[PDB]
Symmetry: C3
Subunit: 390 residues, 3 copies
């Protein structure tokens, strides 16, 4: 039959209001405030956490403040292991109320909520990002959110910790928690190596031209939303590649200029004409390596025929010392993919190369280069096949 959920004779249930809050959270779960580690109240037998609020698939969870320690987690038996401190909902448990409304003594022991230590494969099997209490095909009764990596030493020591920032709704994304900016940087300058194809380092270190003869590795301001992307965990790829943590349609914006651009000088032989040199800036995706996503999670397989390379800028050098460019594209990206930018040109500097024979500021380089990567759409349902291939 046709059932009303919100109608005059309907009864609004806990699962109902949780389904509503989850919708209002854009289906993202996470710590809204607090719930950070309290090292002052942390011993070799207990782990303390500060007061706070979290939402786990529409269910509101609170750690209350009193007198500190706001909450204590038992670490007895945990030793020489790296574990995940998790906030878990278990709907098989029974919440035990006591006292009464009428007296001011109503209280509930929420057995459906626990703070616990899980190993990575156990967390992954019940991770909110992959499984749901509200799921249509495989509904679950137990779901978890990892808060910290906890590394226990020898019996008698206090553990080392690392916050799982993807599960904290800190700042930057509050009104649009599942979307917004994935990555952005300030303008930077980067020397173009004398090769046909090279990646542009987008993760905060550029090879900056500093003199007429030299360039040097220099930091530039960069920011990443840990819920959406991360710097590649492999050192070979760490300067250049992002790992996508969330499927979606993303928008890539790039701008900058090619400085000391090469071209064939107008001479009597070529009828006093500039001989332009072709170059292209491409964005790229690659999913050959599995388990690059956070916790080594299984990558999300893309639809058959998915793009791998997309031309953002494709033209010739125009005979000027410096030539600006800009491009904006929407692209599909999947959890586990590598995403990167490449500069392409010919390798013969006297015929087809956009780069010259100089080094440092005398050599061809990218100047005032910057980008923004932003999540703008999801790939759920039919969009996976209709929108996911490009």
């Amino acid at each position: 039959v046709l059932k009303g959920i919100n109608f005059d004779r309907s009864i609004v249930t806990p699962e109902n209001e949780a389904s509503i809050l989850d919708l209002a959270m854009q289906n993202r779960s996470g710590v809204l405030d607090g719930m950070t580690i309290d090292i002052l109240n942390t011993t070799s037998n207990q782990l303390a956490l500060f007061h706070g609020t979290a939402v786990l698939q529409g269910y509101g969870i609170e750690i209350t403040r009193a007198a500190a320690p706001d909450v204590l987690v038992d670490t007895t038996g945990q030793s020489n292991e790296t574990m995940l401190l998790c906030l878990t909902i278990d709907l098989n448990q029974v919440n035990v109320p006591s006292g009464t409304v009428g007296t001011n003594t109503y209280a509930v022991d929420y057995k459906q909520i626990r703070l616990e230590f899980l190993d990575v494969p156990t967390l992954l099997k019940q991770y909110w990002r992959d499984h749901s209490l509200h799921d249509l095909i495989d509904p679950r009764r137990v779901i978890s959110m990892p808060l910290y990596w906890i590394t226990f030493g020898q019996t008698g020591t206090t553990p080392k910790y690392e916050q799982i920032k993807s599960n904290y709704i800190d700042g930057g994304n509050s009104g649009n928690p599942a979307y917004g900016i994935a990555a952005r940087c300030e303008n930077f300058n980067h020397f173009i190596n004398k090769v046909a194809v090279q990646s542009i380092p987008i993760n905060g270190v550029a090879n900056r031209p500093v003199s007429s003869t030299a360039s040097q590795l220099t930091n530039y301001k960069v920011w990443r939303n840990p819920y959406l992307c991360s710097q590649d965990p492999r050192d070979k790829f760490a300067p250049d590649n992002l790992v996508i943590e969330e499927d979606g349609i993303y928008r890539i914006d790039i701008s900058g200029s090619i400085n000391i651009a090469n071209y064939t000088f107008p001479a009597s032989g070529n009828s006093w004409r500039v001989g332009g040199r072709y170059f292209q800036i491409v964005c790229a995706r690659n999913s050959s390596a599995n388990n690059l996503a956070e916790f080594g999670a299984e990558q999300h397989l893309p639809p058959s025929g998915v793009w791998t390379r997309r031309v953002l800028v494709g033209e010739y050098t125009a005979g000027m010392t410096e030539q600006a460019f800009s491009s904006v594209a929407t692209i599909s990206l999947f959890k586990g993919d590598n995403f990167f930018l490449q500069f392409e040109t010919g390798t013969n500097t006297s015929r087809d190369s956009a780069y010259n024979n100089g080094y440092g500021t005398s050599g061809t380089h990218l100047r005032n280069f910057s980008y923004t990567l932003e999540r703008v759409g999801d790939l759920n349902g039919t969009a996976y096949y209709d929108n996911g291939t490009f």
Copy 2:
């Protein structure tokens, strides 16, 4: 007086929680999951639909699953007609509860909800996209959402169906259901016809240069959000024009290059200088034709003085084989408008044209062209006059 809705002594009503959910849905109504046609359980007297959830102006509607058929709709009397299968709320009806809380027998016969067949003019008069149960000036008591076009044959046959995808919140837009991408495509190449003004085909078929002498009509990947736009229903305009289904401020992004660009060769007569050729890429809107929107709905009239053409790129060819361009603009668009892109230049190839005398890859063409159209703002209230003219 000043009335609190959500305060300590307030009573939260069904209309209240529905007004809240509608706000959380960005005022969009639609099927959240399921509610697709079940052809196995569909006969010549009954039409079956699968279990699912929908939200209609903040009211949650559910089709429950048991044992299939999840729901049955009576088709007796319906013959040789094209009808709309609609999900309707009728607040003049009375929901009849039975049983009691205390026993586990409470149940409601939701007479305020029906699955019914309506003709197009009846649906349009009570369509959620134009009328509201919550409306300030003209509040309604009956509102509908069309799910399928149902074409009934002769008495004794099973009907033909077509899903109304604009009313299904499938994928791509989940956390931002009333906004997000309207249209996007992969990079494509398109031959420039030897004319002053031409539309750029944005609906998935381009005239691709394939040899030094020929171009051929070739499909490219394109995606449209049916809630926001559709391919023009008239075959004359179908390769080039979108029909806007929803008023708003939209963002248009374009990028690509002009390949084999024409220019006046540097000769002794012009003092060995490149003679550039002017061209422009414009976006355009046109509302002269009424009833282009879904169901032949009345177009939304724009404010007096509304724009019709906007220059996105305006410059000269620079004497290079290929020259890149990019542009981003925000524009107002109205339900029923045609939206399209045009390429403009002179027609004298020896004096003012950006195009040459070649064909296929030897002729001037757009290369690596792509666009994104996205809804970024609404045109309700004062924004209609202040923001709606440009």
Copy 3:
């Protein structure tokens, strides 16, 4: 302990549903409909307001309609003063219910809600944009939203009014009330003054080239979201500067062309080659002047090392009559900042200037220039330091 808010044994309180609605409003408060001044029912002792709905930090407030006047505010004693008509929540007050559910006589006198006149410093101390009933560190019990500037004359006169549009959720932003477009304009043409550095007038008046000898100040279509930005209140800066009203990560899009661009003519002395002229378009922020934000509110101090200038386009003129450009960047902006765009070039027209010696249409000018400024992210929590410096 671990407390559930939305669980099976939980009791959902008024503060709970208000916290949920505030989340659904992206933490923005404001009038959703109506609540505009009713001058027909306004006298020298009373001020009338029309029926409407507002949300103040998740609490729903309603002015009910009956028979007009929908509500009356006492103005006795108010004279020769500029005051703020405010909608205030005071949780120290007690809402007084009367009658009963069972009879159809339940009614509440909402003493926790008032319409009142406050001076600017009192409003600022309890302004919802700076303080919260839900605040973690400094929770408040009294919070206000200003609706109108009310200027009272001599005893016996009806007052003058000015709507505070930043506190009315009118149109343009309904589904994304705290984000969306801040400012946008139609294409305009602007003469480039013969100077090294100049601001580009973004607030609706451009110096339009109209003849081969003259340019004239001409209006162009522009729109600003008053919640996000305003035209500079100082006449010296009013044509060029925006005042940012809300912290965040913003996206700036620019496009246009440089028409009648200057360059060194190819002559025998320079080996028949175009001598390009460097120019750059920069966006800029400046927070030296405090109290530029609405009501003269204290500016939000940026993190140490914050950017002030960012190159959007940096290149040489290419020897063409007209050269197009486009750029998209994300930038941090703070409440109280000035935001503006600048055009930069050399001042020697025979050696390094992108501008020539002409005036009007014969002189170098920006053609088809337009921009969009949009709020795309917040700067709360850790994002303030990690994302706020660029």
